[PDB]
């Protein structure tokens, strides 16, 4: 919002606790400090003093900190008033603070917003502030913090400076220059691949368990979860609603999706559930097939049920799992039929769940070989796509038409797209939309 | 566990926030100060420095305040660390802190005790302190029942039982070496020890895979079939979750969704409409929903406006009110107001919320959201609760290791019994208390010692 307008916001999560901290920043911070305290303590001093109400009655007691700019989180004069984790007194204090003219509850991201407006840090580091306050896995949290340290900004600045030097080479105008044009491409491709591996643990992937009713997909999902996830019984059509479960096999996220058994039933609800499952199959990154071993010995996908193979689009990895393999006595392990993985295991007994977990871990591109790395965003991937497209078009134009002006224009556009994440060229609308998603008071 | 113990705890409430506070009070305070920050900043100064680990990496960056006694909250060596309100990062930092020898996690409202008995806090509010401790302790006890609630609370049992059995066969032939019990005193004892160790790893590997905790406060929406439960859940979630139809008992399996409200997390629970079940699936789903109801935290009972104008929850369906736990807060959602036309808003009936809303269109949703946030949830939500279990089980494996190492030397059973007793004492913090008299009773019931 308005930079000149002083703002106040609650920092600590709502509820009750030992300390409820209020953060105020703006040009009215000193006047509000006098109004609520009647004095200005030494900056960066943990002073124990009471809080003063408008009528003069003691509002509360705590720790008051005064941080004159620019040696603060935002660079302006910021008052950090820590009291107690009492929401009622916090409400009264916030009302008193808002009473004074010139104060207003800043919109979410304003604390990051203004700090970004003063060029404290890279723009994408602002989003890096998020994705860490609310994570899902320990590995994801560590990667988000490492990114918050600011390595991605280093890589982006190096790439942009190399692109600027190449653009200069154009303006000023060897083979080594082409070798550099290609090795910068190689390093950018490697960093983009690592980023693709990044943000992969922000959601992991989607795996669809597909099979007929009276199969045990509900049971397999239940065993993977390790709790009582769903209802298991011999009644046909055991599950109708789409079931989603977020789990981590080993330091990695993933969403396992259950579905109703594929059969034609007069039930409208069952038909809707089948429709939902067929909708979700395409979105999923991977699909597994569960078929009873006793029902049919066929392992090729066509024999089991020729309809599903035809219906499912190609280019999607698929695996077949032989549930109830204990009754059949089949050797438990990993095999391949028609080029697709085939596992055997029994849900109720739990045998073969470990091999299923190992297959899920290994099949998806990931491993513990590389640590630290980086966590990226969809917008980052789109910007990388556009930059790579521009670079490829520029190189093709050079090779074929030898158009120096066209190559220079393509290189400049690619550099601008790459710097879009840095925010030098990004418009204010994108910054505002990104900052709005942040929680209030951040 | 003297009053001089240095304790580490979290001050900020659980959930999402921009700042997290960890406070340590005790003799080892300075030790922790040097262990985490690798130095001691200026006292009562807003120093700035990131948090480092043993490997040398950074776990968080924030503000550290060091307050030597007696001018502090508890009048002792107090350390305050402020960083980012991330549950995962907070858990990592707490795990880093706890590894130091002689440290332990604080009990419910221990800092109130420390700051009260040191005369650093006023004396008038004795009753207020008496309640502030009890409420936190009760909430902590209520938690940790979700920590040990799945397959994870299936190996530890095994473990403990195995240990008990071993102890029964190791202590007995130290107290009754005059009966005919054919004790296993031969070397095979160590063999029976090995499996116990091999069992513990399994437990330590059980919680490393599965669900993802998903801290928050539980809310349940329930009523009779076709009462708007699906519509209410879909509206609250903001995305389609369950099918919406007029068929009785459309949904048969419980559904769980997660939603944040201005930094306060909440978990919406959908269950099949309550009624008499003529099907195995329906009856089992009704039982599951009923069982989930008791463990819930907040409950919104469906009251269809079309069905009747009754407002009192007891009159609408007294049996559910009677079956409900007394402490369980209850709210009343008069569904289908848009058709009935009853004015939207917030009201009170016999002290319980009564809210008429239009679920089919979204009328009155903001009122329910306002009531939900205004309702409150102290601490001990999830991660910390399971940290206690992962710590108690942690400081038993080393005792078993050191006890087993003894057997390699002269076979002295007294030291083995001491180590096993210490290990079982540590394990008792998870399941329950196992006094010596219980071991004696099991020995009596297992053998024909008699007299
Ligand atoms: N012993 C054993 N039991 C199994 C095996 N596969 C499935 N079951 C049993 O199948 C029973 C019925 O579960 P059910 O509700 O049909 O699961 P479902 O997944 O809903 N069936 P469907 O996959 O067709 O949807 C469970 O109690 C489970 O123990 C197996 O390999 N071994
Ligand atoms: N006219 C009207 N209908 C409503 C309103 N709120 C909910 N409903 C109806 O309530 C019905 C509830 O049935 P359904 O969607 O199956 O969900 P449910 O309430 O969980 N029923 P069940 O327990 O049988 O699964 C919905 O189909 C919806 O049309 C409302 O405000 N007005």
Cα A390-A394-A400 angle, rounded to 5 deg = 145
DSSP state of B224: S
* Resolution value in angstroms: 4.0
Residues with CB under 6 A from ligand 2: B 225-231, 244-246, 248-251, 272-273, 335-336, 338-339, 358-360
Answer yes or no: are the C-beta atoms of A111 and A9 closer than 8 Å.
Answer: yes
B contact residues 84-123, partner A, Cβ 8 Å cutoff:
84-89, 91-92, 111
CA atoms of B15 and B379, how far apart (whole Å): 9
Residue B188: exposure state from Cβ atoms within 10 A (0-12, 13-18, ≥19):
exposed
Chain B residues inside the 8 Å CB shell of A138: 88, 91-92
Cα A94 to Cα A4, A22, A83, B408, B422: the distances in Å are 20, 8, 12, 67, 52
- How far is Cα A54 from Cα A363, in angstroms, rounded to an integer? 65
Look at A16 and B377 and tell me if their CB atoms are within 8 Å: yes
Please confirm whether the linkage preceding A70 is cis (ω < 30° from 0): yes
CA A216 – ligand 1 centroid, Å: 4
Terminal alpha carbon distance of chain A: 13
Q: CA distances (Å), A96 to each of A111, A161, A310, B276, in order? A: 21, 50, 68, 55
CA distance B21 to B80: 7
Nearest residue to A18 (alpha-carbon basis) of A63, A77, A50: A63
What's the rounded Cα separation, in Å, for the pair B244 and B241? 9
Atom of ligand 2 lying closest to residue B270 CA: 20
- CB proximity B16 to A under 8 Å: yes
Q: Do A226 and B58 touch (CB under 8 A)?
A: no
| Share in percent of chain B as helix, strand, coil (round to 5) | 40, 20, 40
Q: What is the DSSP letter of A426?
A: -
- Contact between chains at B65 and A45 (C-beta distance less than 8 A): no
Distance A215 CA to ligand 1 centre (A): 6
Q: Which of A152, A175, A169, A124 is nearest to A411 (CA)?
A: A169
The reply to whether residue A135 touches residue B262, judged by beta carbons under 8 angstroms, is no
Are B84 and A132 inside 8 Å of each other by CB?
yes
Token pair for A13: 């999560």
Instruction: Kindly state whether B285 is in contact with chain A, defined as any CB-CB distance less than 8 angstroms.
Output: yes
- Paired residues of A45 in beta bridges: B45
Query: The dihedral of CA B213, B217, B223, B229: what is its sign?
Result: negative
Find, in chain B, the residue whose alpha carbon is nearest to that of A11: B18
Backbone angles phi, psi at A97, to 5 degrees: -65, -45
CA–CA gap between residue B229 and residue B244 (Å, rounded) = 9
Burial A1-30 (b: 16+ CB within 10 A, else e): eebeebbbbbbbbbbbbbbbbbbbbbebbe
Contact between A124 and A152 under an 8 Å Cβ cutoff? The reply is yes
- Using CA atoms, how far residue B112 sits from A229, B1, B11, B12, in Å, is 40, 17, 12, 15
Q: In terms of C-beta density within 10 A (0-12 exposed, 13-18 middle, 19 or more buried), how is residue B440 classed?
A: middle
Q: How far, in Å, CA of B109 to CA of A240, rounded? A: 46
Of the candidates A332, A365, A334, which has an alpha carbon nearest to the alpha carbon of residue A197? A365
Give the nearest partner residue to A149 out of B58, B214, B378, using CB atoms.
B58
Start-to-end CA span in chain B (Å): 40
- B contacts of A231 (beta carbons < 8 Å): 252-253, 281, 284-285, 288
**Closest Cα to residue A377, out of A192, A253, A249, A159?**
A192
Q: Which two tokens stand for residue B316?
A: 């609408």
**Is A148 within 8 Å of A132 (Cβ atoms)?**
yes
Instruction: Classify residue A397 as exposed, middle or buried by CB count within 10 Å of its CB (0-12, 13-18, 19+).
Output: middle
B246 assigned to a ligand binding site: yes
Nearest to B65 by CA among B47, B85, B38, B39: B47
Q: Which of A291, A297, A363, A277 is closest to A324 using CA atoms?
A: A291
Ligand 1: residues whose CB is within 6 Å? Answer: A 211-219, 231-234, 238-239, 261, 323-324, 326, 346-349
* B445 bridge partner residues: none
SS3 A413: helix
Beta strands in A162-308 (DSSP E): 206-210, 243-247, 254-258, 286-292
Comparing CB atoms, the residue among A46, A63, A138 nearest residue B88 is A138
A82: part of which helix (H) or strand (E)?
strand A78-82
* Of A178, A87, A156, the residue nearest A384 (C-alpha): A156
User: Distance of alpha carbon B193 from its chain centroid, rounded?
Assistant: 31
What CA–CA distance (Å, rounded) separates A139 from B178?
A: 58
CA of B228 to the centre of ligand 2 (A): 3
The answer to whether the beta carbons of residues B225 and B273 sit under 8 Å apart is yes
Beta carbons within 8 Å of B216's beta carbon, 6+ residues apart: B15, B258, B265, B266, B267, B381, B382
Question: In terms of Cα–Cα distance, which of B427, B381, B426, B438 is closest to B91?
Answer: B381
Question: If DSSP codes are grouped into helix, strand and coil, which group holds residue A365?
Answer: coil
Interface A–B counts its CB contacts (< 8 A) at 182
| Contacting residues of A for B108, CB less than 8 Å apart | none
| Residue B231 known to bind ligand | yes
A197-218 in b/e burial notation, b at 16+ Cβ within 10 A?
A: bbbbbbebbbbbbbbbbebbbb
């Amino acid at each position: 919002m308005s930079d000149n307008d002083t703002i106040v916001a609650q920092a600590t999560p709502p509820g009750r606790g030992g300390v409820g901290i209020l953060r105020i920043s703006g040009f009215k911070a000193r006047e509000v400090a006098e109004t609520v305290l009647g004095k200005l303590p030494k900056p960066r001093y943990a002073d124990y003093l009471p809080f003063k109400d408008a009528d003069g009655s003691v509002l509360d007691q705590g720790i008051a900190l005064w941080f004159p700019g620019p040696n603060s989180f935002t660079g302006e004069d910021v008052l950090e008033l820590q009291g107690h984790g009492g929401p009622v007194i916090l409400d009264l204090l916030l009302k008193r603070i808002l009473t004074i003219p010139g104060l207003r509850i800043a919109r979410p991201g304003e604390f990051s917003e203004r700090a970004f407006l003063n060029d404290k840090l890279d723009l994408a580091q602002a989003e890096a502030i998020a994705d860490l306050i609310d994570a899902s896995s320990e590995q994801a949290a560590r990667s988000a913090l490492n990114s918050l340290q600011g390595a991605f900004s280093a890589r982006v600045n190096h790439l942009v400076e190399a692109l600027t030097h190449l653009r200069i080479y154009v303006e000023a105008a060897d083979g080594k220059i082409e070798a550099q044009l290609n090795d910068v491409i190689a390093d950018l491709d490697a960093v983009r691949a690592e980023a693709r591996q990044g943000s992969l643990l922000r959601e992991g992937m989607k795996v669809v368990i597909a099979g007929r009713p009276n199969a045990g997909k509900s049971s397999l999902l239940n065993a993977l979860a390790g709790r009582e996830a769903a209802i298991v019984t011999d009644i046909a059509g055991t599950t109708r609603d789409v079931l989603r479960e977020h789990i981590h096999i080993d330091g990695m996220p993933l969403h396992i999706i259950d579905t109703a058994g594929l059969r034609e039933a007069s039930d409208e609800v069952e038909r809707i559930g089948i429709e939902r499952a067929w909708q979700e199959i395409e979105q999923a990154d991977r699909v597994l097939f569960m078929v009873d071993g006793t029902t049919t010995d066929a392992v090729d996908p066509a024999e089991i049920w020729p309809e599903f193979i035809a219906r499912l689009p190609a280019k999607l990895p698929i695996t077949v799992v032989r549930n109830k393999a204990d009754i059949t006595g089949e050797t438990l392990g990993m095999s391949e039929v028609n080029g697709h993985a085939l596992i055997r295991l029994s849900a109720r007994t739990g045998e073969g769940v470990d091999v299923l977990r190992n297959h899920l871990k290994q099949s998806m591109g990931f491993d513990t070989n590389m640590e630290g790395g980086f966590l990226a965003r969809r917008r980052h991937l789109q910007a990388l796509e556009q930059a790579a497209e521009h670079l490829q078009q520029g190189k093709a134009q050079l090779l074929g038409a030898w158009a120096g002006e066209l190559l220079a224009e393509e290189l400049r556009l690619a550099q601008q797209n790459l710097s879009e994440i840095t925010g030098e060229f990004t418009s204010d609308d994108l910054l505002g939309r990104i900052f709005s998603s942040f929680c209030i008071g951040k």
